[PDB]
Enzyme design. Sequence first.
Site, PDB file in Angstrom:
ATOM      1  N   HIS A   1       4.080  -9.028   7.229  1.00  0.00           N
ATOM      2  CA  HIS A   1       3.396  -7.417   7.454  1.00  0.00           C
ATOM      3  C   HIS A   1       2.327  -7.450   6.270  1.00  0.00           C
ATOM      4  O   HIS A   1       1.011  -7.353   6.689  1.00  0.00           O
ATOM      5  CB  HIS A   1       4.128  -6.105   7.110  1.00  0.00           C
ATOM      6  CG  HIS A   1       3.591  -5.094   7.182  1.00  0.00           C
ATOM      7  ND1 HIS A   1       2.461  -4.498   8.653  1.00  0.00           N
ATOM      8  CD2 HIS A   1       3.472  -4.325   6.296  1.00  0.00           C
ATOM      9  CE1 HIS A   1       2.369  -3.173   7.876  1.00  0.00           C
ATOM     10  NE2 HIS A   1       3.241  -3.013   6.871  1.00  0.00           N
TER      11      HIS A   1
ATOM     12  N   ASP B   1       1.640   3.711   1.594  1.00  0.00           N
ATOM     13  CA  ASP B   1       2.035   4.369   2.944  1.00  0.00           C
ATOM     14  C   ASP B   1       3.562   4.400   2.936  1.00  0.00           C
ATOM     15  O   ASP B   1       3.789   5.341   3.433  1.00  0.00           O
ATOM     16  CB  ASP B   1       1.307   3.778   4.268  1.00  0.00           C
ATOM     17  CG  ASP B   1       2.290   2.679   4.505  1.00  0.00           C
ATOM     18  OD1 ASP B   1       2.585   1.072   3.526  1.00  0.00           O
ATOM     19  OD2 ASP B   1       2.479   1.988   5.487  1.00  0.00           O
ATOM     20  N   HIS B   2       3.664   3.915   1.998  1.00  0.00           N
ATOM     21  CA  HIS B   2       5.685   3.910   2.205  1.00  0.00           C
ATOM     22  C   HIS B   2       6.027   4.071   0.639  1.00  0.00           C
ATOM     23  O   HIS B   2       7.513   3.825   0.188  1.00  0.00           O
ATOM     24  CB  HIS B   2       5.970   2.960   3.179  1.00  0.00           C
ATOM     25  CG  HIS B   2       6.209   2.998   4.171  1.00  0.00           C
ATOM     26  ND1 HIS B   2       7.633   3.817   4.556  1.00  0.00           N
ATOM     27  CD2 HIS B   2       5.364   2.949   5.392  1.00  0.00           C
ATOM     28  CE1 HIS B   2       7.432   4.402   5.584  1.00  0.00           C
ATOM     29  NE2 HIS B   2       6.308   3.387   6.617  1.00  0.00           N
TER      30      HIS B   2
ATOM     31  N   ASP C   1       8.109  -1.358   8.472  1.00  0.00           N
ATOM     32  CA  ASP C   1       7.210  -1.963   9.025  1.00  0.00           C
ATOM     33  C   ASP C   1       6.959  -3.061   9.116  1.00  0.00           C
ATOM     34  O   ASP C   1       6.250  -4.230   9.037  1.00  0.00           O
ATOM     35  CB  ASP C   1       6.091  -1.443   8.551  1.00  0.00           C
ATOM     36  CG  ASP C   1       4.737  -0.516   8.761  1.00  0.00           C
ATOM     37  OD1 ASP C   1       5.608   0.518   8.742  1.00  0.00           O
ATOM     38  OD2 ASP C   1       4.337   0.216   7.511  1.00  0.00           O
TER      39      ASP C   1
ATOM     40  N   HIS D   1       0.655  -1.212  -0.085  1.00  0.00           N
ATOM     41  CA  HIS D   1       0.181  -0.055  -0.111  1.00  0.00           C
ATOM     42  C   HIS D   1       0.758   1.415  -0.072  1.00  0.00           C
ATOM     43  O   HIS D   1       1.847   1.597   0.173  1.00  0.00           O
ATOM     44  CB  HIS D   1      -0.999  -0.410   1.460  1.00  0.00           C
ATOM     45  CG  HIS D   1      -0.054  -0.380   2.854  1.00  0.00           C
ATOM     46  ND1 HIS D   1      -0.143  -1.486   2.772  1.00  0.00           N
ATOM     47  CD2 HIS D   1       0.006   0.828   3.681  1.00  0.00           C
ATOM     48  CE1 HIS D   1       0.834  -1.473   3.707  1.00  0.00           C
ATOM     49  NE2 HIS D   1       0.465  -0.539   4.707  1.00  0.00           N
TER      50      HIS D   1
ATOM     51  N   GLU E   1      11.386   1.644  11.069  1.00  0.00           N
ATOM     52  CA  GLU E   1      10.071   2.406  10.759  1.00  0.00           C
ATOM     53  C   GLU E   1       9.935   1.903  12.384  1.00  0.00           C
ATOM     54  O   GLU E   1       8.636   1.385  12.757  1.00  0.00           O
ATOM     55  CB  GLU E   1       8.797   1.608   9.964  1.00  0.00           C
ATOM     56  CG  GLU E   1       9.857   2.445   9.163  1.00  0.00           C
ATOM     57  CD  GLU E   1       9.375   1.884   7.506  1.00  0.00           C
ATOM     58  OE1 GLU E   1       8.219   1.356   7.641  1.00  0.00           O
ATOM     59  OE2 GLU E   1       9.382   1.674   6.480  1.00  0.00           O
TER      60      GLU E   1
HETATM   61 ZN    ZN Z   1       2.920  -1.162   5.757  1.00  0.00          ZN
HETATM   62 ZN    ZN Z   2       4.000   2.289   7.098  1.00  0.00          ZN
END
Ligand code: ZN
Ligand code: ZN
Lengths: 588, 409, 624
Positions: free
Chosen positions: A147, A62-63, A168, A60, A193
């Site tokens: 993850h 987010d990174h 993550d 996704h 992170e």
């Molecule tokens: Zn993530």
């Molecule tokens: Zn993240």
Amino acid sequence: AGQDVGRSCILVSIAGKNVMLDCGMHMGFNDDRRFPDFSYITQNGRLTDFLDCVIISHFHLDHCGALPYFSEMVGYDGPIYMTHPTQAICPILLEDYRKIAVDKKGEANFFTSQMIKDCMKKVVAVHLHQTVQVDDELEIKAYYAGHVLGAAMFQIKVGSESVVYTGDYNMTPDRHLGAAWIDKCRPNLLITESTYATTIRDSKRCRERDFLKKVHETVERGGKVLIPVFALGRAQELCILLETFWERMNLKVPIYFSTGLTEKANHYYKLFIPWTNQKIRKTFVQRNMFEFKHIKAFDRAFADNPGPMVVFATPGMLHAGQSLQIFRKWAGNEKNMVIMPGYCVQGTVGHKILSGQRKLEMEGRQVLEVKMQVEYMSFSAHADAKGIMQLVGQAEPESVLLVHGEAKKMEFLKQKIEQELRVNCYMPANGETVTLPTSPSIPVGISLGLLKREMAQGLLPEAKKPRLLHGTLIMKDSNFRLVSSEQALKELGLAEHQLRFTCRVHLHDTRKEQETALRVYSHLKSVLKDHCVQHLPDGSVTVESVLLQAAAPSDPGTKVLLVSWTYQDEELGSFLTSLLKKGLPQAP
Amino acid sequence: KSHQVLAQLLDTLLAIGTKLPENQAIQMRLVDVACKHLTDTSHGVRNKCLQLLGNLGSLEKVQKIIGDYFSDQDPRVRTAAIKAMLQLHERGLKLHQTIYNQACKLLSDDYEQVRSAAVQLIWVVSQLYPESIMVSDGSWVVRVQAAKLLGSMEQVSSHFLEQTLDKKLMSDLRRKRTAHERAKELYSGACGAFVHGLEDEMYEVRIAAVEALCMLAQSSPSFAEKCLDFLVDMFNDEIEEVRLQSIHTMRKISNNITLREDQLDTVLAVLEDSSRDIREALHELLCCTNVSTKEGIHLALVELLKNLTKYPTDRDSIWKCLKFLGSRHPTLVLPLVPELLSTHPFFDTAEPDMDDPAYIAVLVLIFNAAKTCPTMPALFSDHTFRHYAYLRDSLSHLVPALRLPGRKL
Amino acid sequence: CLSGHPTLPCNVLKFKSTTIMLDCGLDMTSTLNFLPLPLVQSPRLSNLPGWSLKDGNAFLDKELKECSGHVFVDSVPEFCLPETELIDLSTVDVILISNYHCMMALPYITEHTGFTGTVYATEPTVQIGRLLMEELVNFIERVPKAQSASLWKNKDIQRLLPSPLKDAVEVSTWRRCYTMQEVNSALSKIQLVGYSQKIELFGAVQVTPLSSGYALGSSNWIIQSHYEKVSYVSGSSLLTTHPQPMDQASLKNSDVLVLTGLTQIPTANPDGMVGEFCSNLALTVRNGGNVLVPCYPSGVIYDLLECLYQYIDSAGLSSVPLYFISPVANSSLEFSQIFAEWLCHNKQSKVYLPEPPFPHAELIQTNKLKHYPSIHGDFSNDFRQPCVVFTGHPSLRFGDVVHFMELWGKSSLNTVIFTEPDFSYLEALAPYQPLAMKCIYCPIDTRLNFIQVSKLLKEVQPLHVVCPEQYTQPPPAQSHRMDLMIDCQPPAMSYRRAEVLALPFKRRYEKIEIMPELADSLVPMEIKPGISLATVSAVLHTKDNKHKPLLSGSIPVEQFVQTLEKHGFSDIKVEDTAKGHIVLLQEAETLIQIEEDSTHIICDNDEMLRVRLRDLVLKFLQKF
Ligand SMILES: [Zn+2]
Ligand SMILES: [Zn+2]
């Protein structure tokens, strides 16, 4: 010395590492809550297309959000390669993001599809732990970590300099997660992170317990349970657990979910099926992941507020229309459950409304009256409080960099580093956005030892001597790498220089040569005993490296003793050169 | 001369001296000294002379050599050293307490096939005697849990740690270091490995974990009320191995425990599949346990009736488990007697079938619970007395003797 | 002090059990037993009929060795095992694995004698090997008759009396069974190993897989020290290119190039053999009865599966389904479905439902494909046999192919076409020779053809290549060279030849870390000093700069007297000899003679002048 010039500290982490004259941008991200200000990545720190390693972290955005969109400006055909599972989920996620946000007359996004197609099929995949051949003196190895079922950390080794960029990482997995592996490489730069630093992570069993009890309490009051999550993210565990709950209680509820291009989601999840745990691999004949029942309805248009219904919106915090337009009806009712399975930054709309904004507009002076039981759980599956300390205690790092934190929580994240001061006290500097934090590294040169050094292993073991292990084999640096002990004389073309220091000492004695010979012989067996000396038939003595003869006498009262010692034990002879100077003993 | 020649000669000496003689007077002490004086330069005979001196016990008094060799060059020689020291352990030899300090340098080895034996070493040195030092009470357990917490890093060093803790739990077991282990956030112990060691990797370590759990619950009468929840909620594991092991560890702890609402998570193991060899174990488990209220009794009864009407091929096990359940606690069924069998206060009709395998179970359960009940026949029907008279005279291994006024003797 | 020497106990050309030793690594390559050997015994079958029971009596009152056309043993097939006696398993640390083939004898060396160490391999090969051992033990334990062949193994003086092909092989240690204990207690030791990993065993030596393209996981492990290129080759193919084809970007300056797998059939053509097999199956399904193709489990059979699937657009009409009889058939199918990352880069592994390896098997499953992974009461729905049946089997004696062969043994109605060439003609069909079938032996196998290894050796330019067997001579019943070209010399291996062809003399490790020291100046060798106190930790003596060198070099007398005058000395008289120079200094009466590679100093009782002259003469040369 690595630079590790970070680019963000709260969201859209797009930090880059500049080491050994090589700049690598890891997981180029972009913000999702902006308007012509932070839509793409912050590319104001570089105006070129020279990168050493372009690696993304997980699925996704987010990174990994800008590496798939801003590739038109800076297009490279080199290190843009990614891992294997990031080849089918990325196209569909960017597609639905475009048709959800860019299709509503956005400020600036990917307009044409040909550029997207080429920058996706130009990527080369990387298998499990596959060391891709980089430009020169660089290697990228990907470990395993559960993850998002396909996330992994990468380790860049450039001249005895290994940096691990993990996206993550979390512990305590479930059926739709895996276990993180570190391989115990002992790196030096750990850019981690940290999201849940002070909040301790509880067990998952009580988590599912409270989730099921709150779902039962919501269904008992005929409330519409609308759970918002990503398209293909941490919602798989949610749907599988609610399915098990429905089959355990044997209910006839709707339990609908958004389409989100479901015609290929199960296919992509069951085709590879390699970035998962063993609990699904052993029993792949029963179709535990896909081929589910009671969850084949579409809550896009058939979601009406009439009775108890379970809906799944494909939005993290009601981005454009999934959890904002299709979930606006069940927001003002007193009996309505809105479960959030994620924790984004304090910049979106739904997250801000749930945090402290009990009455706020949606887009522009919209309906602010909203009274419900909105409560978010800890199902984000991000870096927990135990996993971070377990990793920093098992890795023994030398520099810890905190990236992708928060605005205020980061102020407490450094406090967690204080705890590290008791276990892994090192150069733990939390760099902010666009704030580079360099670090000093060792040299770690390269040499080449011959077989003579193996002899040093003989005297080291089975002995009690100290501070003398390899006091030989002088360096022979040249255009190549080579050291030796006696072969240097052979390769330089010369022999051993014969050095023999000789002196003529005088002794005051009027007795016979045999008498003084026996005297010096008995005297050499008193002060020192580790040296072996034998007597020659002519009447002289000789140490194993020093020879003592009697020169031509004369005044007969003085006797001239010729001493000679080779340079190999010259200093030892110097010690000998001292003894005859403390006088003659008074015993005869 | 060669590297393998010395190893072969040492193996021949061990086979000729540690297999037949096994005595004193230059039969086990001279060969050990000869092997110790035959040291090498680089991995020549070390891994061999270690087990040489291991299989030759001098006398009940030789540890300085292994003590100073514990810091050798090749990590593969530490394995030989630790197996030799375990061979010396299993024969007594009065192991000292200082090795534990050296064992600390074995906890952080950064290698494999060493920590899996280091946990066993710390376990044995803690189980030798908890004196001569806090005071070796609940101290090595913390190190064992810290070493077992990294179960995802090695699938072999985690099961051995749990197997060692299974016997290490026989120590004083201080509550301050035992109650905090069952939670994530520690309340000197600052580790987990109890709630994080189950759903981490393959089940070969889960089996050892639950084995250590039942081993520590059998000795200590406490700690059961806070681990029964964890032992119950680990049933939805979709593994044919963990289920039977859970049945076994619950049957081995069926004492001084309660069951109020955790029964539904442990009884549903019979509907998901056939489980021909697990059904008898589940029935033996359900009968030896205790039920808090009558709701659990009713749930178990209706579930057994469902299993009977769906699988009538194991009615003997059902009758035996119902007999055991009725003999364990007969009071919990007293407020349920007029609800099980269909009776009416002023009709007395709807007589059930005699040869029905669904009513004979309830009949024998009531008859077995009728042992110590003050007034059992006060709620019986008309045909219940003749049913008891027929079942008692036909079989005696399931229906006991009562004191009904209608019957005699 | 030792060197690398392969200690091989086998003489099998397809398989290999070599053990390439080292100074401190002690690595061992893949180990396999003789799979095609257990075929002379009676085939293991259920529901013994009357035709395979009453036969000719034994020779010289044996009552344990029946005879029907040839010699046979009515007992357990008595699986073969290599000697593995002159190397003890107590000093072994790891055993190598091949492409899902070299674990048939793996559980026999794990919990029997030694091998208490670890093991490294990949997931698809180990899973396929697990399924293979599972189906093998399933085919063995059915009707487990006792062993009645423990009499002809000894007394080899009469073992040469019976007919040939029976006394050609000896008996040393054969186990015949697995007991379902070591096979499943030894598999819980494998670690997750991918491709080109950095496991760094023993802290000194490193192994790097290569992932050659022959089948699902045909990895060629390359064990290498700091300066060494030991290359082991298990299986490779340069014609299929589907399962991650072999790449030659790493094995350039190789050292030994251990080549094990070969093709053994250079005259046949893959395309031609598949074409003639298709024509044969078409002509036998057009008229006659059912079709039987005895093949192996998942693996090599997938190309034949794809060819028969794509052959549906030919003269062969529909209603010709495919039965697959194997106890691990469904597991193998789901494993082929789940394993897709080990395919090609972009030709096969596309992930858009176009794997072209296993997805095509399920794409045609909806039209006409009934699996039925059992034989115990599953064909009761329809029984007409207008189909083709494939039964997995380790050999022609264990699988269910013998029951089907005894079922429709009538000729001119069925086929006995094989797919694995690791068998024979007169011995494989020895108990079934009283028939009239076509007996076609299409050899489906592509393993480093002679035309491929030639160009491989040309593009590699190798040296000291070891030959696995004694096949350097022309094979029988053939008229051609069929040999390998070697520049230096062709080596030779046998059952117990531990030849030594290696010499790693600790080439260059030096454990270089934090090395800071001065550097002198010279023509091309800037020598410098060294530091003691190495303090090695694990296969690395990191001699860091912390807490006696010899001399060499001629000293000129001209520069000597110049520095004596400009340092403060005077009254120095120098004379010459035939070859040397004699210098006298009047203070302390110092006499110094300098000859070619020779210096000698003589003086009286004095210490300060002695040390001064010492430091004055020592700084005129370079320290080594
Ligand atoms: Zn993530
Ligand atoms: Zn993240």
